[PDB]
């Protein structure tokens, strides 16, 4: 049980002096929610794996431990998961003092988009390398790290940050994406501030050797942030990739990926050989070995699995056999959306008896196909629908549980809140001196508090499938909505304020806040992302960082890479065959005046959507 | 603590001249520890002192002076011979005969070189500390030799004395130069009284007078 | 002398009242160009 | 050429260096501009 | 390069262009719903226009008035005279940023101005009373090809 | 191990002994010891108290002035030095480093702590960032943070966020204020022109007395010339 403010599970200063998983197959500690070890000192943890890490802390965070004080031989450690911090983030160890990490790996998101103003050393593998014999050998970090530096002393470095006192990164990789919002900080792909606080002797700064980083770093260098005359990097490599006009402030190296593979002593572990636990692990939905399994319709089975969730594989294949070739169901399909004449209906239990008019299927070709829906073979356990003359069966992903028992309990408590109260100021990272005038959500907060019933009913409708008549699951939902009431309200206000623009007659205020599976990735819950956005901090909810907040909280969960990619994607699904700039000029209310020059050459060049 | 006096107050080495250090102790350094009761410690202002040699019988790693330094009795004389620009700090001698340190003494082994001109900088009104009302104007001149630099403060074409404060930093080993920054504390009303503030510095190296003139509100 | 760069090669234009000894020598039209004289109708007499 | 120092490198090769921000750089003088734009036409701005 | 306006909004009671700099908490709809959310704290002194190198800001000259373009050309010349208006080489070492703008490479401040400038923006037909003392180019896009 | 940390400084009541503890690690009494040195700062400096080896049962000769004013306590579990230094006089305050004083047996090394004993209580230091009124020299950039009415001078550390190769940060010695005898200090640092980009912000890193650091944005940007065209 997570301590209310406990730093780590194991509070002892030196731990796992010899923790090895060598017994049989490799074993992994799934679902860590806080650093495994508070500190380390001469302790060698080896062959340990972490699969689903979701560590968030105000203080420096380290998936394995927060600080390796002396000679900790970390080895064969593979950590995967999302890490979010504020005062400093670390891949494996937030600070490695006189400790060496060899043959380790990392593959997860790292978010530090909070508006903190302090000296932190965030790194995809280790935060701070200060030891003389400290070394990183044969390591790899696929870190899609995003952070906001907003000050010169910060250092975001992918494989490592602020490497100091002769620590050497040898034969390491770095294949992720770094997205610093502004160029103020020293941000680089494979190392950060190689220079040291004491005089920078060419040897006292740091050392790199046979390192490669094909990371799509933005607002920074590809190898080393601070470049000087007596540079101590010995061999560096960087595969050609967009640096978004490239800065070209980093060393240039060749491709021949075959040669690049040899640089890493240990390529990967993947076996985990330890093969059980997970929730998203079973996607079968094992179409093969079914009574009527066919080979050419295999994908079609998947293409119908999104239409009949919580159904037997036999029914899946039986309804897949009825699909015809003339229909557009032979392309890869993402999750659909039920709409009542361009309304994006989500609350099913209120609109299930009413025949929902349209069902919009969004194929992987970014094509929208509208089918007719009628309430047919209606059940009280799970609603059902038919699809035109094809006779296919469609069902919503909700069990139509008693929402009123949860509403009547959680609505009165959510109603008694104020924008200038102490609960919101405590949920945010705000001291009583500064004001909330930079959020610009007061009016929208009052509005979202007024009509809370509709939004709250929509939220419960998509968060979870409650197949329980006993009040234990409804009580769990009540507790999850009550324990984070302030964060829930802040997230619900933020997502409703800056996301309520229409695509013709379709408002994405319901398709972005809710329905997170529209671009695939149905695993995320719309209630979990709201809580993660509420308590994300005052800087993440800030109005100025609306473009970076999407990449940290909403992205990597809705299945999209960035906010602009999401907007262009939505322009493809609805309002197709029209330029995105035309949709922008038609939707916004700001009076936009554009004047193409009279010269025919520039008049023809300006029209193209091409950038620049 | 009896040996608070070190031979001389300030002894200058001319870029390789190598000053000789020979402190005197009230207790005689003759102790039965099978070695002479003398050692030399060199400490820069800030960091804790490091002993150059222990008991004047052996030389520690990275010694400032290659030449040996063995002394006996209350007064001992030794020559560093090897001279480095970096070695420009106070040095303390502690006898190995007894566990006691002659602190409060030290030797200023200064340095003589061509009188390099010292840069002069003038700094304008600052928004910070305005609420306090203690308006302070600072003019900075560093890496300028001679070691002793005369400072003056002129406000509204009038000489200023007493209120102005002058601080001298320890000589840098690499450049063998002394930089002194002048700090002035004035009331907010006092700043209003004089429209322009001028900083003037006089040095042996520059016969011509050098001064910096700034006007409040002119950034 | 300029605060940005240490070199004093930069030149600033200065307009002054010409002396009587120069005035009598301005008889040639070519001399106007050679003695570097400019009309005072629109240009101030102070240094630029 | 008169206002955009594109003849700077030429100056440096011929001479006329200037210490800009602590680095040796070319100093484009009016004599160089006159000898490059109008090499054979004129020799002094007064002649031009 | 963006050309933000002053942020100095004016109520219906103000006689001319008001000088009340907004404080980012202003009730004015523009500050609450757009300029404030896209935070860009600008120095906002009462008079003058400055080009930060990556943008242009109007504090006194209104962007829409006819005197807005005569300041627009000055600000743009300061903003992009290092690799645009020149052949590609930087400014001269001695000449400052104010040399390549007020005297040269700027449209005249007034039509009747007796200055050596190039009327590149303002297009004024002979219909206006400005025809008297035109002392400049009639049409910029017509004369310069 | 060779790590030691000072404590209990900057506010010792007059006439009352103050306690300073050095957190020595793996220290051995037979080959190592802990001492407190009265080196102080720019005044009359003598000596404090130094501890003998464990084989000596923590018993060593002490100065007559030092005797009866300093108390020394040694704990095996603590593994550090407790200074029981007594009847604290007004001029008693100084700087002492806790480490083995070149012991023949073995060497244990050092740091020291600074405390100021006065009737006035440990006022928080104030530091303010000043832009240069005059343009800086070619390549190098000069920016400085001024400390006014700060207490106590020892131990206070001032640092600059931005770091550059061959950076110069002249340190200025404490100066008594005209009223209240407040300490005066300032930090000056120079970095290459390429290192400080236009619009870049630098914050001074100053600690008044082992308390949360405060930052005041200083000016290093070279953004120049504000356009002021006049229509006449």
Could you give the count of β-strands of chain F? Answer: 14
- Distance, first to last CA of chain F: 78 Å
Number of helices of chain B: 1
Strand content of chain B: 25-35%
SSE arrangement of chain F, N to C? EEEEEEEEEEEEEE
CATH class of the domain at 126-219 in chain F, please? Mainly Beta
Q: Architecture of the domain at 126-219 in chain F, CATH level 2?
A: Sandwich
Query: Largest beta sheet of chain F: what is the strand line-up?
Result: 8-9-12-11
Helix/strand-derived category of chain B reads: mainly beta
Order of helices and strands of chain B: EEEEEEEEEEEEEEEEHEE
Strand order of the largest sheet of chain B: 5-4-3-7
Largest interface: B-F, 50 and 53 residues
- CATH top level of the domain at 119-215 in chain B? Mainly Beta
In the CATH hierarchy, the third-tier topology of the domain at 126-219 in chain F is known as Immunoglobulin-like
Number of helices of chain F: 0
Helix content of chain B: under 10%
Remind me, CATH topology of the domain at 119-215 in chain B? Immunoglobulin-like
Oligomer: part of a larger assembly
Which features characterize this protein?
part of a larger assembly; 6 chains; B: 219 residues; mainly beta; Immunoglobulin-like; 4-stranded antiparallel β-sheet; 1 helix; 35% strand; elongated; F: 232 residues; Immunoglobulin A1 protease (chain A); immune system; IgA1; metalloprotease; Immunoglobulin A1 protease
Question: How are the SSEs placed, and which strands pair?
Answer:
The structure is cut from a larger assembly and holds 4 copies of chain A, 1 copy of chain B (219 residues) and 1 copy of chain F (232 residues).
Chain A: E1 18-20, E2 44-46, E3 49-57, E4 61-62, E5 74-75, E6 78-85, E7 89-90, E8 101-102, E9 105-106, E10 110-112, E11 121-122, E12 135-137, E13 140-141, E14 146-147, E15 155-156, E16 168-170, E17 186-187, H1 202-205, E18 207-209, E19 211-212, E20 236-237, H2 257-263, H3 298-305, H4 313-321, E21 337-339, H5 348-351, E22 358-362, E23 368-375, E24 385-387, E25 392-394, H6 404-415, H7 422-427, H8 442-450, H9 452-463, H10 471-483, H11 485-497, E26 502-503, E27 506-507, H12 526-534, H13 546-554, H14 563-573, H15 580-587, H16 600-607
Parallel strand pairs in A: 1-2, 3-6, 4-7, 5-8, 6-9, 6-10, 8-12, 9-13, 10-14, 11-15, 12-16, 15-17, 16-18, 19-20
Antiparallel strand pairs in A: 21-22, 22-23, 23-24, 24-25, 26-27
Helix pairs in contact in A: 3-4, 6-10, 8-11, 11-12
Chain B: E1 10-13, E2 20-21, E3 40-43, E4 50-54, E5 58-59, E6 78-79, E7 90-92, E8 108-111, E9 119-123, E10 134-135, E11 138-144, E12 150-155, E13 158-160, E14 164-168, E15 178-184, E16 186-187, H1 188-193, E17 196-202, E18 210-215
Parallel strand pairs in B: 1-8
Antiparallel strand pairs in B: 2-6, 3-4, 3-7, 4-5, 9-11, 10-16, 11-15, 12-13, 12-17, 14-15, 17-18
Chain F: E1 18-22, E2 35-36, E3 49-50, E4 72-73, E5 81-85, E6 95-96, E7 113-114, E8 126-130, E9 140-150, E10 157-160, E11 171-172, E12 183-192, E13 201-207, E14 217-219
Subcellular location (chain D): Secreted, Cell wall; Membrane
Function (chain D): Zinc metalloproteinase which cleaves human immunoglobulin A1 (IgA1) in the hinge region.
Protein name (chain D): Immunoglobulin A1 protease
């Amino acid at each position: 049980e997570l301590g209310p403010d406990e730093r780590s599970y194991i509070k002892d200063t030196f731990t796992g002096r010899l923790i090895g998983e060598k017994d049989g197959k490799n074993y992994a500690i799934y679902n860590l929610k806080k650093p495994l070890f508070e500190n380390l000192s001469g302790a060698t943890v080896e062959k340990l794996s972490l699969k689903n890490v979701a560590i968030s802390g105000k203080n420096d965070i380290g998936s394995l431990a927060n600080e390796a004080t002396n000679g900790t031989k970390i080895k064969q450690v593979h950590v995967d998961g999302v890490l979010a911090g504020e005062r400093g983030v670390g891949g494996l160890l937030a600070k490695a003092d006189q400790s060496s990490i060899a043959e380790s790996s990392f593959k997860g998101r790292i978010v530090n988009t909070y508006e903190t103003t302090d000296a932190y050393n965030i790194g995809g593998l280790v935060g701070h390398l200060t030891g003389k014999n400290a070394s990183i050998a044969k390591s790899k970090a696929t870190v899609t790290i995003s952070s906001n530096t907003n000050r010169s002393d910060q250092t975001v470095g992918g494989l490592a940050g602020l490497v100091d006192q002769d620590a050497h990164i040898q034969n390491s990789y770095a294949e992720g994406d770094i997205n610093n919002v502004k160029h103020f900080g020293k941000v680089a792909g494979v190392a950060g501030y190689l220079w040291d606080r004491t005089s920078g002797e060419e040897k006292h700064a740091g050392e790199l050797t046979n390192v490669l980083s094909d990371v799509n770093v933005t607002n920074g260098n590809a190898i080393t942030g601070y470049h000087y005359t007596g540079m101590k990097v010995a061999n560096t490599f960087s595969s050609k990739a967009n640096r978004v006009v490239s800065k070209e402030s980093f060393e240039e190296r060749g491709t021949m990926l075959d040669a690049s593979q040899i640089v890493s002593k240990k390529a990967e572990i993947n076996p985990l050989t330890l093969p059980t636990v997970s929730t998203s692990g079973k996607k079968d939905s094992d179409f093969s070995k079914i009574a009527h399994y066919q080979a050419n319709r295999a994908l079609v089975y998947k293409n119908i699995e999104k239409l009949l969730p919580f159904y037997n594989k036999s029914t899946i294949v039986k309804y897949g056999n009825l699909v015809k070739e003339n229909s557009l169901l032979y392309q890869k399909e993402l999750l659909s959306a039920v709409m009542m004449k361009d309304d994006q209906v989500i609350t099913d239990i209120v609109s299930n008896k009413q025949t929902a008019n349209k069902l919009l299927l969004h194929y992987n070709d970014h094509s929208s196909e509208k089918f007719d829906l009628k309430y047919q073979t209606d059940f009280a356990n799970l609603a059902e629908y038919n699809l035109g003359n094809t006779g296919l069966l469609y069902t919503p992903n909700q069990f139509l549980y008693d929402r009123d028992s949860i509403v009547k309990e959680v609505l009165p408590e959510l109603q008694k809140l104020d924008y200038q109260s102490d609960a919101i100021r405590k949920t945010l990272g705000i001291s009583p001196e500064v004001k909330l005038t930079e959020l610009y959500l007061e009016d929208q907060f009052s509005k979202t508090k007024q009509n809370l019933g509709d939004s709250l009913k929509k939220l419960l409708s998509a968060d979870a499938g409650l197949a329980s008549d006993n009040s234990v699951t409804r009580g769990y939902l009540v507790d999850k909505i009550k324990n984070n009431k302030e964060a829930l309200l802040l997230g619900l206000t933020y997502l409703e304020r800056w996301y309520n623009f229409n695509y013709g007659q379709v408002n994405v205020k319901d398709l972005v806040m809710y329905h997170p599976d529209f671009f695939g990735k149905g695993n995320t819950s719309p209630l979990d992302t709201l809580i993660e956005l509420g308590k994300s901090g005052f800087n993440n909810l800030l109005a100025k960082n609306n473009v970076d907040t999407y990449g940290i909280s909403l992205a990597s969960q809705h299945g999209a890479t960035d906010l602009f990619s999401t907007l262009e994607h939505y322009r493809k699904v609805f309002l197709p065959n029209t330029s995105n700039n035309d949709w922008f000029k038609s939707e916004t209310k700001a009076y936009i005046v554009e004047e193409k020059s009279t010269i025919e050459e520039v008049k023809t060049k300006q029209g193209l959507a091409g950038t620049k | 603590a009896a040996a608070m006096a070190q031979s001389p107050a300030s002894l200058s080495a001319s870029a390789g001249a190598a000053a000789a250090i020979a402190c005197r102790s009230s207790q005689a350094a003759a102790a039965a520890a099978a070695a002479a009761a003398l050692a030399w410690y060199a400490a820069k202002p800030g960091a804790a002192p490091a002993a150059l040699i222990y008991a004047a019988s052996a030389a520690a790693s990275a010694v400032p002076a290659r030449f040996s330094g063995s002394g006996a009795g209350t007064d001992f004389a030794a020559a560093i011979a090897a001279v480095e620009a970096e070695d420009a700090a106070a040095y303390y001698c502690a006898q190995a005969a007894a566990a006691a340190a002659t602190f409060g003494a030290g030797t200023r082994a200064e340095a003589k070189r061509t009188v390099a001109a010292p840069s002069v900088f003038i700094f304008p009104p600052s928004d910070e500390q305005l609420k306090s009302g203690t308006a302070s104007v600072v003019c900075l001149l560093n890496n300028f030799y001679p070691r002793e630099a005369k400072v003056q403060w002129k406000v509204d074409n009038a000489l200023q004395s007493g209120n102005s404060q002058e601080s001298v930093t320890e000589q840098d080993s690499k450049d063998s130069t002394y930089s002194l920054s002048s700090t002035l504390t004035l009331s907010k009303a006092d700043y209003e009284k004089h429209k322009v503030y001028a900083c003037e510095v006089t040095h042996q190296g520059l016969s011509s007078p050098v001064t910096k003139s700034f006007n409040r509100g002119e950034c | 002398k300029d605060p940005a760069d240490g070199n004093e090669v930069y030149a600033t234009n200065v307009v002054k009242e010409l002396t009587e000894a120069e005035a009598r020598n301005l008889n040639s039209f070519e001399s106007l160009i050679d003695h570097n004289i400019l009309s005072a109708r629109e240009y101030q007499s102070g240094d630029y | 050429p008169y206002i955009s120092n594109q003849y700077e490198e030429d100056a440096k090769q011929q001479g006329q260096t200037i210490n800009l921000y602590g680095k040796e750089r070319g100093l484009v003088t009016d004599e160089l501009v006159l000898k490059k734009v109008f090499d054979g036409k004129y020799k002094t701005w007064a002649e031009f | 390069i963006l050309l933000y306006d002053a942020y100095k909004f004016g109520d219906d009671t103000t006689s001319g262009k008001a000088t009340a700099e907004a404080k980012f908490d202003s009730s004015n709809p523009a500050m609450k719903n757009f300029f404030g959310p896209v935070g860009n704290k600008v120095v906002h002194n009462q008079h003058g226009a400055y080009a930060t190198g990556d943008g242009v800001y109007y504090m006194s000259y209104r962007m829409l008035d006819k005197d807005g373009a005569i300041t627009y050309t000055h600000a743009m010349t300061h903003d992009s005279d290092q690799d645009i208006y020149l052949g590609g080489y930087g400014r001269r070492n001695g000449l400052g940023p104010e040399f390549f703008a007020k005297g040269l490479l700027q449209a005249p401040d007034q039509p009747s101005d007796a200055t050596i400038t190039i009327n590149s923006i303002l297009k004024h037909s002979k219909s206006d009373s400005t025809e008297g003392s035109r002392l400049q180019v009639l049409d910029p896009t017509e004369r310069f090809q | 191990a060779v790590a030691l940390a000072a404590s209990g400084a900057a506010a010792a009541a007059p006439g009352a002994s103050l306690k300073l503890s050095c957190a020595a690690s793996g220290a051995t009494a037979a080959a190592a010891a802990a001492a407190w040195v009265r080196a102080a700062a720019g005044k009359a400096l003598e000596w404090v108290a130094a501890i003998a080896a464990a084989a000596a049962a923590a018993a060593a000769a002490a100065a007559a002035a030092a005797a009866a004013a300093a108390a020394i306590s040694a704990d095996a579990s603590a593994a550090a030095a407790a200074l029981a230094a007594a009847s604290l006089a007004a001029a008693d305050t100084a700087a002492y480093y806790c480490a083995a004083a070149g012991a023949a047996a073995a060497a244990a090394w050092g740091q020291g702590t600074l405390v100021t004993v006065s009737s006035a209580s440990p006022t928080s230091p104030k530091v303010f960032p000043l832009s240069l009124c005059s343009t800086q020299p070619d390549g190098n950039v000069v920016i400085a943070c001024l400390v006014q009415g700060f207490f106590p001078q020892e131990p206070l550390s001032v640092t600059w966020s931005e770091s550059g190769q061959g950076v110069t940060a002249r340190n200025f010695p404490p100066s008594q204020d005209a009223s209240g005898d407040l300490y005066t200090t300032s930090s000056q640092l120079t970095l290459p022109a390429t290192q400080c980009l236009a619009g870049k912000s630098v914050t001074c890193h100053v600690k008044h007395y082992t308390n949360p650091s405060q930052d005041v944005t200083v000016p290093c940007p070279a953004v120049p010339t504000p356009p002021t065209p006049s229509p006449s």
